[PDB]
Design a protein around this motif. Structure first.
Motif, PDB file in Angstrom:
ATOM      1  N   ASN D 106      98.027  59.765 -30.626  1.00 53.54           N
ATOM      2  CA  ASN D 106      98.364  60.563 -31.773  1.00 53.54           C
ATOM      3  C   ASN D 106      99.682  61.384 -31.593  1.00 53.54           C
ATOM      4  OD1 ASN D 106      97.704  60.727 -34.592  1.00 53.54           O
ATOM      5  ND2 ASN D 106      96.945  62.822 -34.259  1.00 53.54           N
ATOM      6  N   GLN D 107      99.918  61.911 -30.365  1.00 54.81           N
ATOM      7  CA  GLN D 107     101.132  62.712 -30.008  1.00 54.81           C
ATOM      8  C   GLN D 107     102.361  61.950 -30.343  1.00 54.81           C
ATOM      9  OE1 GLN D 107     100.964  66.177 -29.216  1.00 54.81           O
ATOM     10  NE2 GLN D 107     102.946  65.716 -30.139  1.00 54.81           N
ATOM     11  N   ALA D 108     102.312  60.666 -30.015  1.00 56.38           N
ATOM     12  CA  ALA D 108     103.466  59.792 -30.144  1.00 56.38           C
ATOM     13  C   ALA D 108     103.812  59.562 -31.590  1.00 56.38           C
ATOM     14  CB  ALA D 108     103.233  58.478 -29.425  1.00 56.38           C
ATOM     15  N   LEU D 109     102.779  59.310 -32.389  1.00 59.34           N
ATOM     16  CA  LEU D 109     102.970  59.162 -33.832  1.00 59.34           C
ATOM     17  C   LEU D 109     103.502  60.510 -34.433  1.00 59.34           C
ATOM     18  CD1 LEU D 109      99.695  57.142 -34.796  1.00 59.34           C
ATOM     19  CD2 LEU D 109     101.847  56.164 -35.620  1.00 59.34           C
ATOM     20  N   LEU D 110     102.903  61.625 -34.003  1.00 58.41           N
ATOM     21  CA  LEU D 110     103.297  62.924 -34.499  1.00 58.41           C
ATOM     22  C   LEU D 110     104.764  63.143 -34.258  1.00 58.41           C
ATOM     23  CD1 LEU D 110     100.601  65.405 -33.267  1.00 58.41           C
ATOM     24  CD2 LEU D 110     100.688  64.391 -35.612  1.00 58.41           C
ATOM     25  N   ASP D 111     105.189  62.919 -33.017  1.00 61.83           N
ATOM     26  CA  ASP D 111     106.582  63.136 -32.631  1.00 61.83           C
ATOM     27  C   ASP D 111     107.512  62.147 -33.354  1.00 61.83           C
ATOM     28  OD1 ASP D 111     105.726  65.383 -31.083  1.00 61.83           O
ATOM     29  OD2 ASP D 111     106.562  64.660 -29.207  1.00 61.83           O
ATOM     30  N   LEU D 112     107.015  60.930 -33.569  1.00 63.76           N
ATOM     31  CA  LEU D 112     107.768  59.975 -34.331  1.00 63.76           C
ATOM     32  C   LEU D 112     107.849  60.325 -35.825  1.00 63.76           C
ATOM     33  CD1 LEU D 112     109.627  57.261 -34.435  1.00 63.76           C
ATOM     34  CD2 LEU D 112     107.458  56.098 -34.137  1.00 63.76           C
ATOM     35  N   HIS D 113     106.743  60.746 -36.447  1.00 61.46           N
ATOM     36  CA  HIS D 113     106.835  61.322 -37.804  1.00 61.46           C
ATOM     37  C   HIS D 113     107.917  62.447 -37.963  1.00 61.46           C
ATOM     38  CE1 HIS D 113     105.808  63.326 -41.569  1.00 61.46           C
ATOM     39  NE2 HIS D 113     105.226  62.185 -41.908  1.00 61.46           N
ATOM     40  N   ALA D 114     107.897  63.409 -37.016  1.00 64.33           N
ATOM     41  CA  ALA D 114     108.781  64.606 -37.014  1.00 64.33           C
ATOM     42  C   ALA D 114     110.210  64.206 -36.794  1.00 64.33           C
ATOM     43  CB  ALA D 114     108.373  65.640 -35.971  1.00 64.33           C
ATOM     44  N   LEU D 115     110.442  63.254 -35.863  1.00 60.38           N
ATOM     45  CA  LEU D 115     111.755  62.603 -35.690  1.00 60.38           C
ATOM     46  C   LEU D 115     112.200  61.964 -37.007  1.00 60.38           C
ATOM     47  CD1 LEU D 115     114.227  62.061 -33.650  1.00 60.38           C
ATOM     48  CD2 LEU D 115     113.388  59.716 -33.481  1.00 60.38           C
ATOM     49  N   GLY D 116     111.326  61.145 -37.605  1.00 60.16           N
ATOM     50  CA  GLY D 116     111.480  60.614 -38.973  1.00 60.16           C
ATOM     51  C   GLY D 116     111.968  61.592 -40.049  1.00 60.16           C
ATOM     52  N   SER D 117     111.304  62.737 -40.207  1.00 63.22           N
ATOM     53  CA  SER D 117     111.850  63.728 -41.150  1.00 63.22           C
ATOM     54  C   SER D 117     113.127  64.504 -40.734  1.00 63.22           C
ATOM     55  CB  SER D 117     110.799  64.688 -41.662  1.00 63.22           C
ATOM     56  OG  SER D 117     111.323  65.434 -42.765  1.00 63.22           O
ATOM     57  N   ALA D 118     113.312  64.819 -39.444  1.00 63.17           N
ATOM     58  CA  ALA D 118     114.615  65.378 -38.975  1.00 63.17           C
ATOM     59  C   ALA D 118     115.785  64.373 -39.142  1.00 63.17           C
ATOM     60  CB  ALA D 118     114.533  65.894 -37.542  1.00 63.17           C
ATOM     61  N   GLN D 119     115.473  63.070 -39.147  1.00 63.70           N
ATOM     62  CA  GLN D 119     116.415  61.973 -39.475  1.00 63.70           C
ATOM     63  C   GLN D 119     116.414  61.516 -40.954  1.00 63.70           C
ATOM     64  OE1 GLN D 119     118.586  60.667 -37.409  1.00 63.70           O
ATOM     65  NE2 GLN D 119     117.858  61.491 -35.448  1.00 63.70           N
ATOM     66  N   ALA D 120     115.722  62.266 -41.821  1.00 62.51           N
ATOM     67  CA  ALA D 120     115.529  61.939 -43.257  1.00 62.51           C
ATOM     68  C   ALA D 120     115.173  60.427 -43.587  1.00 62.51           C
ATOM     69  CB  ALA D 120     116.700  62.500 -44.101  1.00 62.51           C
TER      70      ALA D 120
END
Lengths: 170, 170, 170, 170
Positions: D106-120
């Protein structure tokens, strides 16, 4: 809890007041349901509309609570408030109170979504989106449809509009 | 009779006047039924409502008489009275007379139940409860629903309310 | 109300406090339901027992309210109280609180039946009998069965009894 | 690639390390699966739990890779790491290592989601939400349920809890 992850204490608490509002709403729908089954109203279809709603809102709050546990949150219970009125007036007035009701419900989800992103909680945000925001906006459209039609019918001759409405919409 | 048990002579007689009232009522329903099938009324659904009722009341009195024998009571027959009016007016007036009618019918069972307990007769009391008091109160609610809706519709334009009522309720 | 008959103002009000208790109970069941779905309990069958109950009690109160209207009574709403505790302890303690709960519920019907006969209201008395007193006493028996079995299992080794209970009864 | 749109080079690479973690996890599940099928463990239901998981994780990584191509990303492969242990201890210890495992996922997906929005990158964000974050949190709840029940059973008499667990949960 050993299963909780990235679920803020703020979110937890705010969810629970959302829980309370849904349950307040279901119970408000019950009161309305049985108001239009008062003999000096007696409009089965209005009653039947609101019967389905009392079931709907409770189903949502259970949905939420399912998620509460899924995130490892704690259910917190407080009294569930009584509806604000005993008589709901004409159907026009009843549907108006219904509409203030759904407005606030969408408001609550909106504010909880916004809290969710200011607290960086992406699961919570999508959960609201999947099972909820959508039900609301479908249902709001429907209510609106009803209300505008209601008003266009009452203006002429009060009881007639009201009867045809119950019979012939619901 | 060698099968009778704990069935007072008072109860027996009072049952039979209840028998008489149910049968009076069925026959009163017939008259109403065919009144709304007079061409200068002509409302099938009103007629159809009252057709079902003429069957209903007679069915009860048979039920009673079944029980009369079960307790080893004697059926006692007297003339069965004609309905009190020849024209029933508007549907508003007709349903009003129907409602005075069912009121008295429930009254009769109530007074017979109360007589039953002042005479210590528990079977009789439950019999009334099982097949009767319940039908009455379901049906009374229904009548009431109708009447309130009827009035709310007549006020505006007389015939219109009356037509939509017959068509669209029944 | 034009449809009301032999329904005392005392009865009306007393029914409504019964309405409130049933709804309080359903909501108390909800809280319990989701307590045993807390991860640090996690006993699906206990949860599933109480899920069915939350549905059961609400079904009764709707039943009552159906009758409220049938008699031409007025629904009266007040706040519905929160459950008295947040943690319910072991299953032993939870089922104990459930049992205090059903006791009071039967109490309420009993006192309402007795009020019913002191006010000479025979319909009300039979209504309670048909759909309610009976559900209660079946359900109480069942609860009792559970509790005695629970205690006989815990005494030895705490968790083991609790697990086999959830799994193998429910 | 002529079909790629708004898919950052950072996202591409980060996805691929997520790909690697899912595949590592499936392979970690395989090792666990066959560990509880060692004769000196021999718990089919534990084995069967983990068999379904080895299939689950691989299914996700394929899902991801489907999306990788859909966005016009490049699969990048590196070695897939061996599980960190050869013996997993009691079931208590095994499920504990399983739970560390899903947490990180789950951590990995979370961090990837957050990377996703900081990268729009809004498509990427919803993709994670639809097929993944949800599976995780359902499955985590389930694991948790298991672990708490496991511990409550071992404390008394070690083997007995372990056997009833395998048999009677799974």
């Amino acid at each position: 809890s050993q299963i909780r992850q990235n679920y803020s204490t703020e979110v937890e608490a705010a969810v629970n007041r959302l829980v309370n509002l849904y349950l307040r709403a279901s119970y408000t729908y019950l009161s309305l349901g049985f108001y239009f089954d008062r003999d000096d109203v007696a409009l089965e279809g209005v009653c039947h509309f609101f019967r389905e709603l009392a079931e709907e809102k409770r189903e949502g709050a259970e949905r939420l609570l399912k998620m509460q546990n899924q995130r490892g949150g704690r259910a917190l219970f407080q009294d569930l408030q009584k509806p604000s009125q005993d008589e709901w007036g004409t159907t026009l007035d009843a549907m108006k109170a219904a509409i203030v009701l759904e407005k606030s419900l969408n408001q609550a989800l909106l504010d909880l979504h916004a809290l969710g992103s200011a607290q960086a909680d992406p699961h919570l945000c999508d959960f609201l989106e999947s099972h909820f925001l959508d039900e609301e906006v479908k249902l709001i459209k429907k209510m609106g449809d009803h209300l505008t039609n209601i008003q266009r019918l009452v203006g002429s001759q009060a009881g007639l509009g009201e009867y045809l409405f119950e019979r012939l919409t619901l």
